[PDB]
């Protein structure tokens, strides 16, 4: 396992180099949009982000050390959390707004979306309030990938797999601490910020579950276009 052998700095470098790009939406200010067509812009964008996410996951240390069945499971459980934290990260420098894309920056003003919209804004405010660093962000994102589905996986052999994930998770924790120490934080401050960062994941999991329900409702209404990949990721959550 090349993952467990990495140093903290090597871990951060690998995660930074693996970052997916920021994609554009098909938004057009000269074109009128309904609530459904606006939502169509987002589902289209999310679908495209997913393709990049899947290949990003391959570059997260330890992920490919897992069986294909386990990788599938982890991505199926964490995909929406990862899309969301990515969205919040983009919006950090834009108080009151969500940067779905460089050409699509919305405030809460512009259909049952407001509730989740507000939660995302609150998280963005939180990141800004904490002065969340890019190095910390990539750590958080990889933690979600490995953590969200680890307790919903048979044999003692299947138990060995989960053990590997825990060791990688511990390694990322070490990296987070390393980053904070370098930042000049006292030991007490390092432990506090670590807690603050990880508590974020609870709220992100919450937004993901609320979003999954909104997504299921969208499917049933059959008015907003949903990609096949998206429909399969949705079905994986058996709502």
């Amino acid at each position: 396992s090349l993952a467990l052998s990495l140093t903290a700095d090597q871990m951060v470098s690998a995660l930074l180099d693996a970052e997916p790009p920021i994609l554009y939406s098909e938004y057009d200010p000269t074109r009128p949009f309904s609530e459904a067509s606006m939502m169509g812009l987002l589902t289209n964008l999310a679908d495209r982000e997913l393709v990049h996410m899947i290949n990003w996951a391959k570059r997260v240390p330890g992920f490919v050390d897992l069986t294909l069945h386990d990788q599938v499971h982890l991505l199926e459980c964490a995909w929406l959390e990862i899309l969301m934290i990515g969205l919040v990260w983009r919006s950090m420098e834009h108080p009151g707004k969500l940067l779905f894309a460089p050409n699509l920056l919305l405030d809460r003003n512009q259909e049952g979306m407001v509730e989740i919209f507000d939660m995302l804004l609150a998280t963005s405010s939180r990141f800004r309030m904490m002065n969340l660093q890019g190095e910390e962000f990539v750590c958080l994102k990889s933690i979600i990938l490995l953590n969200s589905g680890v307790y919903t996986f048979s044999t003692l052999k299947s138990l060995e797999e989960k053990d590997h994930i825990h060791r990688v998770l511990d390694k990322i924790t070490d990296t987070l601490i390393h980053l904070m120490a370098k930042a000049g934080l006292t030991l007490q401050q390092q432990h506090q910020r670590l807690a603050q960062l990880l508590l974020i994941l609870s709220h992100i999991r919450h937004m993901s579950n609320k979003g999954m329900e909104h997504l299921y409702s969208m499917k049933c209404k059959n008015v907003v276009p949903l990609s096949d990949l998206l429909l399969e990721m949705l079905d994986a959550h058996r709502l």
């Binding site: 393709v51 899947i54 290949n55 294909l68 599938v72 399969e232």
Partner: peptide, 9 residues
């Protein structure tokens, strides 16, 4: 699954 195939490359 699609996710399954994409992971396989």
């Amino acid at each position: 699954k699609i996710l399954h195939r994409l992971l396989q490359e």
